[PDB]
Amino acid sequence: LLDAKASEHAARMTAMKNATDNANELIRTLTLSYNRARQAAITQEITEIVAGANAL
Amino acid sequence: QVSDVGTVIQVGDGIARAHGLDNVMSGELVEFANGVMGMALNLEENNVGIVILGPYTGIKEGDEVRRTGRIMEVPVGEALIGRVVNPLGQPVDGLGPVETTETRPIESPAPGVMDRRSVHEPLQTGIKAIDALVPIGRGQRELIIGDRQTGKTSVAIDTIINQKDQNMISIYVAIGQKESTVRTVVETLRKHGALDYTIVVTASASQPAPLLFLAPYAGVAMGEYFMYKGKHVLVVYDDLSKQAAAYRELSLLLRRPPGREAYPGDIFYLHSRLLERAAKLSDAKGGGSLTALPFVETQAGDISAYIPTNVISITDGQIFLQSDLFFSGVRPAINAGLSVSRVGGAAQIKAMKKVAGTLRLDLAAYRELEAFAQFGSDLDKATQAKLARGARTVEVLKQDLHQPIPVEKQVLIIYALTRGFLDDIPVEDVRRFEKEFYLFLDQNGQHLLEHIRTTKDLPNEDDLNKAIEAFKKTFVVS
Amino acid sequence: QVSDVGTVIQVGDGIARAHGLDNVMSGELVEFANGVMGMALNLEENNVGIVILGPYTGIKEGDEVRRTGRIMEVPVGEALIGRVVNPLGQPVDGLGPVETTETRPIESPAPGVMDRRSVHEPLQTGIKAIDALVPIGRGQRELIIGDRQTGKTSVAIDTIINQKDQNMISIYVAIGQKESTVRTVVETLRKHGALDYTIVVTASASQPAPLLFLAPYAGVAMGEYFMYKGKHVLVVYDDLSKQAAAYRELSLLLRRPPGREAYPGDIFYLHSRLLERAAKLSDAKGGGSLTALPFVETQAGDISAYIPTNVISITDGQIFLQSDLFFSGVRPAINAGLSVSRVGGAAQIKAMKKVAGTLRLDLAAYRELEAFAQFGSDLDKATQAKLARGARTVEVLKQDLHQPIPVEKQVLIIYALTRGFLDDIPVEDVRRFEKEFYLFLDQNGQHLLEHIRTTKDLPNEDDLNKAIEAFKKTFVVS
Amino acid sequence: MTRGRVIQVMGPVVDVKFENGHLPAIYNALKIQHKARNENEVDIDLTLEVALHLGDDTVRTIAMASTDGLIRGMEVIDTGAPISVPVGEVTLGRVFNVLGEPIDLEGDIPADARRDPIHRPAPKFEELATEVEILETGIKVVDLLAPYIKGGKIGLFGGAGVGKTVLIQELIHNIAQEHGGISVFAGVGERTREGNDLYHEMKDSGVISKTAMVFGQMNEPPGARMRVALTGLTMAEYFRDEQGQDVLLFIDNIFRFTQAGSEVSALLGRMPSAVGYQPTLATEMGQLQERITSTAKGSITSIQAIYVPADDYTDPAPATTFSHLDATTNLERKLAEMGIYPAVDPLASTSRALAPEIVGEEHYQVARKVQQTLQRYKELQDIIAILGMDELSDEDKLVVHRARRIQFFLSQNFHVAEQFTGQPGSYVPVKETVRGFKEILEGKYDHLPEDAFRLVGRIEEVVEKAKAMG
Amino acid sequence: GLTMAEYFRDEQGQDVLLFIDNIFRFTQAGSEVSALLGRMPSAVGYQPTLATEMGQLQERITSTAKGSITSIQAIYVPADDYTDPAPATTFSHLDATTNLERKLAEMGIYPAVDPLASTSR
Amino acid sequence: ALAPEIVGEEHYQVARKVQQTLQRYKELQDIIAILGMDELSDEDKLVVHRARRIQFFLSQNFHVAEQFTGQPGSYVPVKETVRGFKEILEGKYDHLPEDAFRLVGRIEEVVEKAKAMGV
Numbered sequence A: 001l002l003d004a005k006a007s008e009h010a011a012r013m014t015a016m017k018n019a020t021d022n023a024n025e026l027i028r029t030l031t032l033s034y035n036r037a038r039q040a041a042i043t044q045e046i047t048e049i050v051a052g053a054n055a056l
Numbered sequence B, C: 001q002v003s004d005v006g007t008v009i010q011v012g013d014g015i016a017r018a019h020g021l022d023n024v025m026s027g028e029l030v031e032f033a034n035g036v037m038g039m040a041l042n043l044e045e046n047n048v049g050i051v052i053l054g055p056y057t058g059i060k061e062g063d064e065v066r067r068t069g070r071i072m073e074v075p076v077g078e079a080l081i082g083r084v085v086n087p088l089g090q091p092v093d094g095l096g097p098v099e100t101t102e103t104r105p106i107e108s109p110a111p112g113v114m115d116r117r118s119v120h121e122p123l124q125t126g127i128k129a130i131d132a133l134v135p136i137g138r139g140q141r142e143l144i145i146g147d148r149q150t151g152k153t154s155v156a157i158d159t160i161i162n163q164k165d166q167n168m169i170s171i172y173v174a175i176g177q178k179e180s181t182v183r184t185v186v187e188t189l190r191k192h193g194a195l196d197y198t199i200v201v202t203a204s205a206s207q208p209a210p211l212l213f214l215a216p217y218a219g220v221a222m223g224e225y226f227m228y229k230g231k232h233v234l235v236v237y238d239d240l241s242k243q244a245a246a247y248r249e250l251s252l253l254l255r256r257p258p259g260r261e262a263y264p265g266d267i268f269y270l271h272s273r274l275l276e277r278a279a280k281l282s283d284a285k286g287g288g289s290l291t292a293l294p295f296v297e298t299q300a301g302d303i304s305a306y307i308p309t310n311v312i313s314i315t316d317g318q319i320f321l322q323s324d325l326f327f328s329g330v331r332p333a334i335n336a337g338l339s340v341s342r343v344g345g346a347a348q349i350k351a352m353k354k355v356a357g358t359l360r361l362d363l364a365a366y367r368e369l370e371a372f373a374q375f376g377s378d379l380d381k382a383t384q385a386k387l388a389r390g391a392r393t394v395e396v397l398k399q400d401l402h403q404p405i406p407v408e409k410q411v412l413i414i415y416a417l418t419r420g421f422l423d424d425i426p427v428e429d430v431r432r433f434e435k436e437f438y439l440f441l442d443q444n445g446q447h448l449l450e451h452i453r454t455t456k457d458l459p460n461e462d463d464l465n466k467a468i469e470a471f472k473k474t475f476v477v478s
Numbered sequence D: 001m002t003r004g005r006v007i008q009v010m011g012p013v014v015d016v017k018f019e020n021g022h023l024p025a026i027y028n029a030l031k032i033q034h035k036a037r038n039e040n041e042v043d044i045d046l047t048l049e050v051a052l053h054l055g056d057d058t059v060r061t062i063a064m065a066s067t068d069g070l071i072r073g074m075e076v077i078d079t080g081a082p083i084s085v086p087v088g089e090v091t092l093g094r095v096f097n098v099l100g101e102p103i104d105l106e107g108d109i110p111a112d113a114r115r116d117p118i119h120r121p122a123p124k125f126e127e128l129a130t131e132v133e134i135l136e137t138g139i140k141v142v143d144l145l146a147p148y149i150k151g152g153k154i155g156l157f158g159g160a161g162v163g164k165t166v167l168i169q170e171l172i173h174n175i176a177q178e179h180g181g182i183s184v185f186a187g188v189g190e191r192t193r194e195g196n197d198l199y200h201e202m203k204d205s206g207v208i209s210k211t212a213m214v215f216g217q218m219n220e221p222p223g224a225r226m227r228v229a230l231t232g233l234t235m236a237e238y239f240r241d242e243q244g245q246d247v248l249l250f251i252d253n254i255f256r257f258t259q260a261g262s263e264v265s266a267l268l269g270r271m272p273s274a275v276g277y278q279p280t281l282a283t284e285m286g287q288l289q290e291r292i293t294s295t296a297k298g299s300i301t302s303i304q305a306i307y308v309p310a311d312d313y314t315d316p317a318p319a320t321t322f323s324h325l326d327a328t329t330n331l332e333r334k335l336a337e338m339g340i341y342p343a344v345d346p347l348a349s350t351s352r353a354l355a356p357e358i359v360g361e362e363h364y365q366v367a368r369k370v371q372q373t374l375q376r377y378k379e380l381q382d383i384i385a386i387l388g389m390d391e392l393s394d395e396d397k398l399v400v401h402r403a404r405r406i407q408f409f410l411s412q413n414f415h416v417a418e419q420f421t422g423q424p425g426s427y428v429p430v431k432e433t434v435r436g437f438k439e440i441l442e443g444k445y446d447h448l449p450e451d452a453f454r455l456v457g458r459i460e461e462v463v464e465k466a467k468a469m470g
Numbered sequence E: 001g002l003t004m005a006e007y008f009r010d011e012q013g014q015d016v017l018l019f020i021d022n023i024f025r026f027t028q029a030g031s032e033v034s035a036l037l038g039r040m041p042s043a044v045g046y047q048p049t050l051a052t053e054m055g056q057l058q059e060r061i062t063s064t065a066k067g068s069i070t071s072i073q074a075i076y077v078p079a080d081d082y083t084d085p086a087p088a089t090t091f092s093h094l095d096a097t098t099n100l101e102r103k104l105a106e107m108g109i110y111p112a113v114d115p116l117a118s119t120s121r
Numbered sequence F: 001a002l003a004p005e006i007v008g009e010e011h012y013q014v015a016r017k018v019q020q021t022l023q024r025y026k027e028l029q030d031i032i033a034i035l036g037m038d039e040l041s042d043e044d045k046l047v048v049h050r051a052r053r054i055q056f057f058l059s060q061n062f063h064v065a066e067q068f069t070g071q072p073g074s075y076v077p078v079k080e081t082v083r084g085f086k087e088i089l090e091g092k093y094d095h096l097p098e099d100a101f102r103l104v105g106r107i108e109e110v111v112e113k114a115k116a117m118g119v
Helices: A002-055 B128-133 B153-160 B179-192 B210-227 B242-254 B266-277 B305-316 B324-327 B350-372 B382-397 B407-418 B432-444 B446-453 B461-474 C128-133 C152-161 C181-190 C208-225 C241-254 C267-275 C306-312 C325-326 C351-368 C380-399 C409-417 C427-444 C448-452 C461-474 D140-145 D164-179 D192-204 D222-241 D254-268 D281-289 D316-322 D331-336 D359-387 D394-409 D430-441 D459-469 E002-012 E024-037 E050-058 E085-091 E100-107 F009-029 F029-034 F042-057 F078-089 F107-117
Strands: B005-012 B015-020 B028-032 B039-044 B045-051 B064-071 B073-076 B104-106 B143-146 B169-175 B198-203 B233-239 B289-297 B318-323 B334-341 C006-012 C013-021 C026-030 C037-043 C048-052 C064-072 C074-077 C102-105 C143-146 C169-175 C196-203 C232-237 C291-292 C296-297 C317-322 D003-010 D013-017 D030-032 D044-055 D058-063 D074-076 D082-086 D115-117 D152-159 D183-190 D211-217 D246-251 D300-303 D327-330 E015-020 E068-073
Touching: A002 D044, A002 F029, B028 C208, B045 B073, B045 B210, B045 B318, B073 B210, B104 B210, B104 D013, B104 E100, B128 B350, B128 B382, B128 B407, B143 B305, B143 D030, B153 B169, B153 B179, B153 B233, B153 B289, B169 B210, B169 B242, B179 D316, B198 B210, B210 B233, B210 B242, B210 B266, B210 B289, B242 B266, B242 B289, B242 E050, B266 B305, B266 D254, B289 B305, B289 D152, B318 B324, B318 B432, B334 B350, B350 B382, B382 B432, B407 B432, B407 B446, B407 B461, B432 B446, B432 B461, B432 C048, B432 C325, B446 B461, C026 D030, C048 C232, C064 C169, C102 C208, C128 C267, C128 C351, C128 C380, C128 C409, C143 C152, C143 C306, C152 C169, C152 C181, C152 C232, C152 C296, C169 C181, C169 C208, C169 C241, C181 D192, C196 C208, C208 C232, C208 C241, C208 C267, C241 C267, C241 C296, C241 C306, C241 D281, C267 C306, C296 C306, C317 C325, C351 C409, C380 C427, C409 C427, C409 C448, C409 C461, C427 C448, C427 C461, C448 C461, D013 D044, D030 D394, D058 D222, D058 D254, D082 D222, D082 D359, D115 D222, D140 D359, D140 D430, D164 D183, D164 D246, D164 D300, D183 D192, D183 D222, D183 D254, D183 E015, D192 D211, D211 D222, D222 D254, D222 D281, D222 D300, D254 D281, D281 D316, D359 D430, D394 D430, D430 D459, E002 E015, E024 E050, E050 E085, F009 F042, F009 F078, F042 F078
Parallel strands: B143 B289, B143 B318, B169 B198, B169 B233, B233 B289, C143 C296, C143 C317, C169 C196, C169 C232, C232 C291, D152 D300, D152 D327, D183 D211, D183 D246, D246 D300, E015 E068
Antiparallel strands: B005 B015, B005 B064, B015 B045, B028 B039, B028 B064, B039 B045, B039 D003, B073 B104, B318 B334, C006 C013, C006 C064, C006 D044, C013 C048, C026 C037, C026 C064, C037 C048, C074 C102, D003 D013, D003 D074, D013 D058, D030 D044, D030 D074, D044 D058, D082 D115
16 A cells, blocks of 8 residues: 555656646747737738828 | 918817928927917928917917927926926916026936946835845936836835935926826825925826926926936836827827837837936036936736837836735735846945845745645745745735835844744734834844944844844744 | 930939830830939839839939830840859859840740640759658759758758759859858859859849849749750749848838738739749750749748748748758758658659658658657567667768769668668668768679669669678678 | 028928939938027037938938927038048047047047948958858857857847856957957947946956947937947948958847837838838848958958847847847856856857868867767756766766866856956967867866866866866 | 716715716727828727827816715726727726626625725725 | 438438547647646547547548559548448447558458558
């Protein structure tokens, strides 16, 4: 029983570490898309403002 | 030969266009027929774009426009101390006129790079968190940025009040604020006795956009009069974002080309021109100094917006206030993780430098491990001790409203916290420990207080430890 | 006089506007008094819009514009080989002028449906990875796409160098590249002897946008003259992304409305009009061919961007260079997942089709099995042999800088691989084994080399196995 | 007569009308010098730069200073050439603004001194050098793991308090000492107090006598903030061309130069591009950078500090800037606390020159081995952190032993640090650095303590220090 | 409505209440009419006079020596985007906040005012 | 045209079941990426097991693609497609490796490919 408890704790620790690594990778892959979308939004907004100004 | 006279062509939204005025200057002050002042901004080929500095409902097409020949300027002098004045120099309170003798233009060249000296004099704001983690020096300009409901006005009021005996002239500029809030702030300053060395410049929301645009320059021009006489001046801009918005409104109404977020191209030039006039003058120039504390308001705490980005790039540091921290009962609500002072270290006394580093390290560790505080099963040695120290550090950094603390008492209490003498005091009783420690100090630690005040350095370690232990002997724990 | 002479009205940002020129035609070349050539785009009712092809500092309002009577053209001929010229055909390297006696229009129609033929002749790049996995045929448009600093120019230089003994004429077009880099590239080509059959067209980043916009069309116009005479031409465009940026700048300067990523509407037409001129002519038209290797630079490996998608939707396949696996430095790693040659395979020689099929499967299996972070199961058949084979294939696919390899030796080494002849030699000795094997081959296996060169099929398998075994016996393992 | 008249004043944009057939050329400099004719006027001394020809003999210009007090109809005089800045020995040890006037208090330059135009075409393809050459800086880490190329652009990354100014001063000192070439510092959009601090640091380090300093104040108009870089570059081009020596050029922040260009374009009213930047961003950057080259009788090499907006390396401004860089050096805060004073990250820094064809096969092999050893130590660090030390194998223990020695030997003592430490500086040749690192990799000095490898210079200093201490 | 309340604040000198059904529509209407009036667009298509219009409306609701006007303004945030210019301008004038909770309403705790979300200076 | 009264009740039911299991597999993707297969419930393992095979079996070899790969290509009738997908959904081929379903065509080709591989 004692050996089983020790093994359970070690396995949970390893699983949590792997989960943290996967979460960090997902975070960076999402930040790339966030930057792309931010650039696209800024471009669209400035284009709309300039077009509205030129319309007059 | 219609040179000094003009006739209005178009009126609307606080903007008027006038024919004639051949010899008018750019940026000149112009008076309309009914007595409403105006400022010339767009000197076009056949007409002049004039912004109106008052109620424009009484101006119709065909009215006469008179040229005054004076560049936009504001009154300066000691007579403005203790007065509430609009950006044009006219008092808004009913206390009567002002007897200023000389005036200076709102737009002036900044001090040259060879006329400055490195910042080396601390500016005590009376707030433990600011004075320990993000120190402010005389001549430095520091940004206070955060959402609403974070007490930026409270910080400004406390740091203005704390200058009562430090021989400094304070100027408070309110842009786009509510007149009721301005009145309450003025009453608070009067009650605490700060009105005998401070000046208040107000331009509320109902005021025309050019007044909001011009208010910070009027404040800086008033401050420079004292700054160039060898004195020290503190200037607070209650909100620069609203001033930028007013400038954007004026530029868009004048049909100037719009940039990002419809702002004109020279918004960064506007803000840099305003904020580059705060400097520490050299000894040959008189040794005066001017420090600025601009405010920037964010929505949902996004520092990535255009105006916050520009102001952060311009200033020498930033103090960040957090909405969740403010809601959690932490009145100062200062986030030390994102705050930074590029002049720090040189702007602190030796006693504060000797103690600030360990406090910063402890706060960083507690902020790292804060999210996992509800686990008492963690490592009994490292994590528990770090959490116990961090909780007491957070309790120590709290402060009451409108009650600034002397720098010597701040040094002593932070030393006591960082040397472990508070490790046995309960987290809930830390505040009471601090209050009775201040009382015990002002009762029988006058030698230590005087030594700190007159040497800017810590007293004997054994004497300080004996005093702390003696106080702990008589302290009572709930 | 306005029938053939005009007068400039406006000058700015590289775009002019002239009054007069009643007889000018759309697309004509015009010459200013300063000597700088120009192109007439818009023929408005009372003025002509002119784009300046050069330095516009010396052009002032009031200058005269003179007609030339020729639609936009470039000189072309045999005298252009071994020279470095700008998009206008003016020599840049010095060495005296160019004695060309013919001209071709910049805007020319592409060959029609009935004028083309299927691609059936291989283009040997001298690179093992490309020639084995992504074959290129004469008359094919193949895109080389990757991030910055991934050796795309090195690949282009190696491909150009490998055409020494083949009946091919190379044209190198540099758009927006550093002039020092172009100088070093030209020096390397001269050192290796490629200037005997290559033409260099340059347009540095300091040049105005119109020259960068016009350079690829000048290059393809120079290539078409050789193509229509029955010869074979290889053209390399170095940055279609930079050309697109220049065109976007010009369009926005012309007040044309932008679209996706501020690019103009016809950004796809700009690239299609250029890349549709590379084709394999039919026997009736003469049997000539022009092949193109456009370059596109990505940001963080994103092939979903506007320009990369536009170029992918035009060419006959793409080669993707992997920045992270470019860690080897000497040779870029071709991502086999995205790289594909739609038209290739049919043009590949018979031996390579026989040999590379199993190498493709081995590399795919290795790349899918890898990234297990040292798994502990280590099943023999599923893991050990496949990993050893994949490591040996990866080692084989490496190459030295500016060291193209003949196709016969490529075939022989790839046959030595994938038949088990390398599974005993350690992976760290694979490169030395390959070098020694090439020396042994060109010393003794002249019969095998001549068989491969005369007929595109493999030699007698028993003889090849005997030769490989003899070399293995003579080889010493570190 | 070449006399113009002001007809429009809209912020920093001024329009001037000339007599027919006498318009100034693009990029010309116009002067306005007015004296108060009465009590309703102010004195004016303003400089304008021609930008566009609007037709009807009208020219649109951008001001170099404040436009307050301008009156329509004021006389404008054309100088007949772009902005001219004095060049030569007289610029050494002086501080200048964009107009070329001195900023310090040592007096004015005589009016007869030679001056050169700000705007100039890039050098021809004929004049460029046909080979790549290495600029020996004398710093071990730079010369080994990220070599500098004559005529190339080097990107510098780092924050405050990490040693940027110390590295700059040491580079200037070493270049002046061992190559006889001066350096030029160009401050674009800097903070005024930081510029003053840097000036005083270069003053008390004894380095300012060999450099020319140009500051574009952050309160200056966008035209000045955009042309300061060209002023510095044309100051350096004189020494490249006439004196025929290798010259350094430092730019405080080029992103602020691009931002100033964007502001100028927005003021001029051109339609925006990309993420709100000017359409001419690429060509402006190319015109700035293409003049920093290595010709047949000289070279200019530039060290540029780069700021990345919102930490996005795909932003158009850093993306365009990175296409011109040839190397990159990163200053590491972690190494700053660890005690490596140069603080250059051995793994983040990269250089195009680290190729066998350029630095040599032996140099390439030594650099690759050092990088591999440092990387292996980097992975092992977590194993030592979590697991026991005994879990390391023999080769892992040897690698850990070698990596600390290599990391400490990458440090160096600077001449600038002498005023604060006492020990003199050292200039280390690249071949000596390669030999020392090869000897360290061979295990020839394993028995020496790791503290003996700190702040030494050449390899013999390590053994001399070890013998002195034991 | 503001003038109707101002009469009672000024003449009768008593504390009164002013309820506004939705303050966002007040700015939206001005944004709609700005383009036809012929002004250049603002950041998110709003009018360039948004801040001054909102200030001139709100600043008349103040406490004086005699009487006062206090206002309860229901605010609608489109798509819960608190960075929108109209809510951003409106929030600069508020002094308190009350949030109604459907969970509390279902539990039967009237007035269903959220005890934690509500704040006041 | 995907209606019970047009394509048939069996066809409609099989298509709906395939779409449902594919949607469930798509939903489980984030949990799979973060934690892995170990945390899925007992039936979610079966859902993933069936969904991967269904997705692979949806592929096909084309007649026009023979010149680039050598695969002769196939033409699968709708009745055969429905029968094969129903058999896969019923769990008849749960033991075969997922690579056997890649580019075959009819359901019998899956068995032939698996047997050739060595199952």
